[PDB]
Design a protein around this motif. Structure first.
Motif, PDB file in Angstrom:
ATOM      1  N   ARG A 122      -7.676  -3.695  19.114  1.00 49.30           N
ATOM      2  CA  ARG A 122      -8.630  -3.893  18.033  1.00 49.30           C
ATOM      3  C   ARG A 122      -9.148  -2.573  17.498  1.00 49.30           C
ATOM      4  NH1 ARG A 122      -9.137  -8.673  18.906  1.00 49.30           N
ATOM      5  NH2 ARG A 122      -8.730 -10.139  17.198  1.00 49.30           N
ATOM      6  N   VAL A 124     -10.387  -0.077  19.927  1.00 47.87           N
ATOM      7  CA  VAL A 124     -11.402   0.360  20.861  1.00 47.87           C
ATOM      8  C   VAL A 124     -10.732   1.129  21.967  1.00 47.87           C
ATOM      9  CG1 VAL A 124     -13.391  -0.369  22.264  1.00 47.87           C
ATOM     10  CG2 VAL A 124     -12.630  -1.801  20.333  1.00 47.87           C
ATOM     11  N   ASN A 126     -10.462   5.184  24.279  1.00 45.26           N
ATOM     12  CA  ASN A 126     -11.291   6.086  25.071  1.00 45.26           C
ATOM     13  C   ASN A 126     -11.023   7.543  24.761  1.00 45.26           C
ATOM     14  OD1 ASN A 126     -10.936   4.028  28.119  1.00 45.26           O
ATOM     15  ND2 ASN A 126     -11.681   3.573  26.045  1.00 45.26           N
ATOM     16  N   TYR A 129     -12.737   5.836  33.613  1.00 42.72           N
ATOM     17  CA  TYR A 129     -12.004   4.736  34.228  1.00 42.72           C
ATOM     18  C   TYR A 129     -12.662   3.371  33.969  1.00 42.72           C
ATOM     19  CZ  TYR A 129      -9.272   2.184  37.723  1.00 42.72           C
ATOM     20  OH  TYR A 129      -8.456   1.278  38.364  1.00 42.72           O
ATOM     21  N   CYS A 130     -11.846   2.400  33.573  1.00 36.81           N
ATOM     22  CA  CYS A 130     -12.334   1.061  33.271  1.00 36.81           C
ATOM     23  C   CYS A 130     -11.558  -0.018  34.008  1.00 36.81           C
ATOM     24  CB  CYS A 130     -12.261   0.801  31.769  1.00 36.81           C
ATOM     25  SG  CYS A 130     -13.163   2.005  30.791  1.00 36.81           S
ATOM     26  N   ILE A 133      -8.974  -2.939  31.643  1.00 33.49           N
ATOM     27  CA  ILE A 133      -9.356  -4.245  31.113  1.00 33.49           C
ATOM     28  C   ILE A 133      -8.531  -4.512  29.870  1.00 33.49           C
ATOM     29  CG2 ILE A 133     -11.227  -5.763  30.338  1.00 33.49           C
ATOM     30  CD1 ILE A 133     -11.591  -4.718  33.149  1.00 33.49           C
ATOM     31  N   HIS A 137      -5.912  -7.970  28.951  1.00 33.08           N
ATOM     32  CA  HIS A 137      -6.028  -8.767  27.716  1.00 33.08           C
ATOM     33  C   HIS A 137      -4.707  -8.704  26.957  1.00 33.08           C
ATOM     34  CE1 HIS A 137      -6.960 -10.435  23.922  1.00 33.08           C
ATOM     35  NE2 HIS A 137      -7.161  -9.299  23.279  1.00 33.08           N
ATOM     36  N   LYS A 248     -22.856   2.691  13.356  1.00 32.70           N
ATOM     37  CA  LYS A 248     -23.378   1.705  12.415  1.00 32.70           C
ATOM     38  C   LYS A 248     -24.101   0.655  13.268  1.00 32.70           C
ATOM     39  CE  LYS A 248     -23.578   2.316   8.900  1.00 32.70           C
ATOM     40  NZ  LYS A 248     -24.203   2.057   7.548  1.00 32.70           N
ATOM     41  N   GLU A 249     -23.338  -0.193  13.953  1.00 33.80           N
ATOM     42  CA  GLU A 249     -23.964  -1.201  14.797  1.00 33.80           C
ATOM     43  C   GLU A 249     -24.797  -0.412  15.797  1.00 33.80           C
ATOM     44  OE1 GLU A 249     -20.082  -1.142  15.310  1.00 33.80           O
ATOM     45  OE2 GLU A 249     -20.457  -1.300  13.156  1.00 33.80           O
ATOM     46  N   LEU A 250     -24.110   0.368  16.627  1.00 31.98           N
ATOM     47  CA  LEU A 250     -24.756   1.195  17.633  1.00 31.98           C
ATOM     48  C   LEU A 250     -25.196   2.441  16.903  1.00 31.98           C
ATOM     49  CD1 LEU A 250     -23.078  -0.827  19.179  1.00 31.98           C
ATOM     50  CD2 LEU A 250     -21.619   0.658  17.782  1.00 31.98           C
TER      51      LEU A 250
ATOM     52  N   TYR B 129     -18.128   2.468  34.329  1.00 35.98           N
ATOM     53  CA  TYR B 129     -18.314   2.245  32.903  1.00 35.98           C
ATOM     54  C   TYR B 129     -16.998   1.966  32.168  1.00 35.98           C
ATOM     55  CZ  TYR B 129     -20.145   2.845  28.166  1.00 35.98           C
ATOM     56  OH  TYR B 129     -20.506   2.649  26.850  1.00 35.98           O
ATOM     57  N   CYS B 130     -17.001   0.892  31.379  1.00 33.11           N
ATOM     58  CA  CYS B 130     -15.826   0.473  30.624  1.00 33.11           C
ATOM     59  C   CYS B 130     -16.065   0.395  29.124  1.00 33.11           C
ATOM     60  CB  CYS B 130     -15.333  -0.887  31.121  1.00 33.11           C
ATOM     61  SG  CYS B 130     -14.926  -0.934  32.880  1.00 33.11           S
ATOM     62  N   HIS B 131     -17.287   0.717  28.700  1.00 32.76           N
ATOM     63  CA  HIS B 131     -17.652   0.735  27.279  1.00 32.76           C
ATOM     64  C   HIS B 131     -17.801  -0.644  26.670  1.00 32.76           C
ATOM     65  CE1 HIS B 131     -15.963   4.109  29.030  1.00 32.76           C
ATOM     66  NE2 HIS B 131     -14.720   3.724  28.807  1.00 32.76           N
ATOM     67  N   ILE B 133     -15.679  -3.649  27.098  1.00 34.74           N
ATOM     68  CA  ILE B 133     -14.483  -4.264  26.524  1.00 34.74           C
ATOM     69  C   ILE B 133     -14.544  -5.773  26.616  1.00 34.74           C
ATOM     70  CG2 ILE B 133     -11.995  -4.323  26.472  1.00 34.74           C
ATOM     71  CD1 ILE B 133     -13.253  -1.573  25.984  1.00 34.74           C
ATOM     72  N   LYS B 167     -25.801  -8.431  14.054  1.00 36.39           N
ATOM     73  CA  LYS B 167     -26.096  -7.118  14.606  1.00 36.39           C
ATOM     74  C   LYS B 167     -26.808  -7.315  15.952  1.00 36.39           C
ATOM     75  CE  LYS B 167     -26.953  -2.745  12.136  1.00 36.39           C
ATOM     76  NZ  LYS B 167     -27.739  -1.941  13.116  1.00 36.39           N
ATOM     77  N   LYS B 170     -24.109  -9.523  18.496  1.00 36.59           N
ATOM     78  CA  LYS B 170     -23.211  -8.494  19.013  1.00 36.59           C
ATOM     79  C   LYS B 170     -23.932  -7.560  19.970  1.00 36.59           C
ATOM     80  CE  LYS B 170     -20.594  -4.368  17.931  1.00 36.59           C
ATOM     81  NZ  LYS B 170     -20.552  -3.146  17.083  1.00 36.59           N
ATOM     82  N   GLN B 171     -24.788  -6.679  19.454  1.00 37.02           N
ATOM     83  CA  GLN B 171     -25.514  -5.761  20.325  1.00 37.02           C
ATOM     84  C   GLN B 171     -26.031  -6.504  21.554  1.00 37.02           C
ATOM     85  OE1 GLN B 171     -26.781  -3.898  16.782  1.00 37.02           O
ATOM     86  NE2 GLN B 171     -24.759  -3.173  17.456  1.00 37.02           N
TER      87      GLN B 171
END
Ligand SMILES: CN1CC(=O)N2[C@H](c3ccc4c(c3)OCO4)c3[nH]c4ccccc4c3C[C@@H]2C1=O
Ligand SMILES: CN1CC(=O)N2[C@H](c3ccc4c(c3)OCO4)c3[nH]c4ccccc4c3C[C@@H]2C1=O
Ligand SMILES: [Mg+2]
Ligand SMILES: [Mg+2]
Ligand SMILES: [Zn+2]
Ligand SMILES: [Zn+2]
Lengths: 313, 313
Positions: A122, A124, A126, A129-130, A133, A137, A248-250, B129-131, B133, B167, B170-171
């Protein structure tokens, strides 16, 4: 479908008419439909349809599915990335004298797999380490397909066949997560520097096949300055649009790699990459099968165009 | 659908007939169908259907979708987790005198959001941490719905309405990633210890609303020893089955929290959790609205049952 029927009742050229056998090969010229005929060829000159007697009409109902289940919205992680990674897979395999090191299973996995290493991206990504994930998917999407009706290209194998391949496909896709490939390679990078290498050994068959999957993921980084740059401007487009979204969002700032600015330092970022990841992953590879140099070299040929561009900042 | 028609021409009890207004409330007794009448009530006694004149038939076409679009295969992250997190959301709102602190917008976000914070879980979780996903796959799935035809409960808002809410939604969802909630809370945990608190300030409305979302995520951790334990054996089921899986395809060992053994040390793992995350997240909340003590307490009431069970290892 006026789509399947078509690709179905057409004519898959050849590994030569299609020149799908060279590290210098690109998607750029041919239309999607064609990137279907090629791929179909790929399976073909690979013995996948004949051994696993894949139904013509389904290899195509699969692929088309596989394809349409991709977004032309992302600016890199689009169908044209999977194709270009199956290709670079299909070439380091032949013209790389690598094929002769794998089973007919691990070869079906890598084609099927490689055409899905990033199934539902999509945009997204880096930069460091995640636990992979985004990768499950993709597999979960990979599998979602292979199981799908009328697109079951493995519905010809046996229980222990479909297993042994889902174990490679999966472990395979999940290896495009550079993180793992970095929390690993460091070793598969001594079986070489100590030559104690060996592919008969399962684990090493893992480390190899993986280091091979990423090698092809980064396929476009060892491509002719034209083909290569034409792409980095795409990955760039994406890396920047991801920063724009995440501002924007964040309300965070961008990590350079992803800010619409810093475009002037894109070289040293391309350069750093190669030195931090590309170079050794490809040279070291070479040693496995010297018929891979075309990559390790195209790379060095690009990490000298960046060092050039960059020497102007 | 003999389903929608049904839940459509039925009777949504009341906040009292359904007792959906207490921290001690549980899904356990009522059938799914009912977990819809409740949820429907939730919107209703929340003013979402009247303000945003939500089509009766669509809140239900929505809900059912939202639901069916969940797997009864996972042993926690199943529809009954969302319901139980919408609930705990719906009560810290009312019986928690928290509602009087949000707009009518941030209340639709939270209901709509909350019933989707983990929309398409498969049983792939973490432990540190995976941000976020898995969270975008949830949002992307959250949105996938809201847009869907016949299940558009926002097709009554305005451009800047539907925006302002996505917004938040989502957030919001993306805030169930304890990682973020831990790479944040630490501060929202000083607007208290420094009382410099304030919800009029946007950013803080974020940190709040977030801390609140996870507050409801862990909803069951502050539930009556019966309702709570009955669940931890479920979350356990999952945490263990994820270990069994990842010792099958992959060949790794389990992180304790996820190995079918170590089931004896489950208490001190339940204990450390509360102390590492639960406790503070609930006490600190309370200060915002003292009417939330029922949670911070039920928690402490549970973090003394584990300290008992565990004092036997
Ligand atoms: C996580 N990560 C780190 C990274 O630094 N890069 C490079 C890169 C370097 C600088 C950039 C960039 C990509 O986009 C914008 O500025 C880079 N160069 C390419 C050429 C062709 C195809 C893909 C790539 C990538 C992708 C690769 C990646 O996925
Ligand atoms: C990273 N992490 C640490 C941790 O230790 N836990 C707890 C826990 C403790 C022991 C367990 C367990 C969960 O499952 C099996 O044995 C725990 N207890 C719950 C009750 C209800 C819902 C979720 C949880 C979690 C989840 C939570 C978590 O996500
Ligand atoms: Mg990848
Ligand atoms: Mg979660
Ligand atoms: Zn890739
Ligand atoms: Zn949840």
């Amino acid at each position: 479908t006026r789509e399947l029927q078509s690709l179905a009742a057409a004519v898959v050229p050849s590994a030569q008419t299609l020149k799908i056998t060279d590290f210098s090969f690109s998607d750029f010229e041919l239309s999607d439909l064609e990137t279907a005929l090629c791929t179909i060829r790929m399976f073909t000159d690979l013995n996948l349809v004949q051994n696993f007697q894949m139904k013509h009409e389904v290899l195509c109902r699969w692929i088309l599915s596989v394809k349409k289940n991709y977004r032309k919205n992302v600016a890199y992680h689009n169908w044209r990335h999977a194709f270009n990674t199956a290709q670079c897979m299909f070439a380091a395999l032949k013209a790389g004298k690598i094929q002769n090191k794998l089973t007919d299973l691990e070869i079906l996995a890598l084609l099927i797999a490689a055409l899905s290493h990033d199934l539902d991206h999509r945009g997204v990504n880096n930069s460091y380490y995640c636990h992979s994930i985004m990768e499950h998917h993709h597999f979960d999407q990979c599998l979602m397909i292979l199981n799908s009706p009328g697109n079951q290209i493995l519905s010809g194998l046996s229980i222990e066949e479909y297993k042994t391949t889902l174990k490679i496909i999966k472990q395979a896709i999940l290896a495009t997560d550079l993180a793992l490939y970095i929390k690993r390679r460091g070793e598969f990078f001594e079986l070489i520097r100590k030559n104690q290498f060996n592919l008969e050994d399962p684990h090493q068959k893992e480390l190899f096949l993986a280091m091979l999957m990423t090698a092809c993921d980064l396929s476009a980084i060892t491509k002719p300055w034209p083909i290569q740059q034409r792409i980095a401007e795409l990955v760039a487009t994406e890396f920047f649009d991801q920063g724009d979204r995440e501002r924007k969002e964040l309300n965070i700032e961008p990590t350079d790699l992803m800010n619409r600015e810093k475009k002037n330092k894109i070289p040293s970022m391309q350069v750093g990459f190669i030195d931090a990841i590309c170079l050794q992953l490809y040279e070291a590879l070479t040693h496995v099968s010297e018929d891979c140099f075309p990559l390790l070299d195209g790379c060095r040929k690009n990490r000298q165009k960046w060092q050039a561009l960059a020497e102007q900042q």
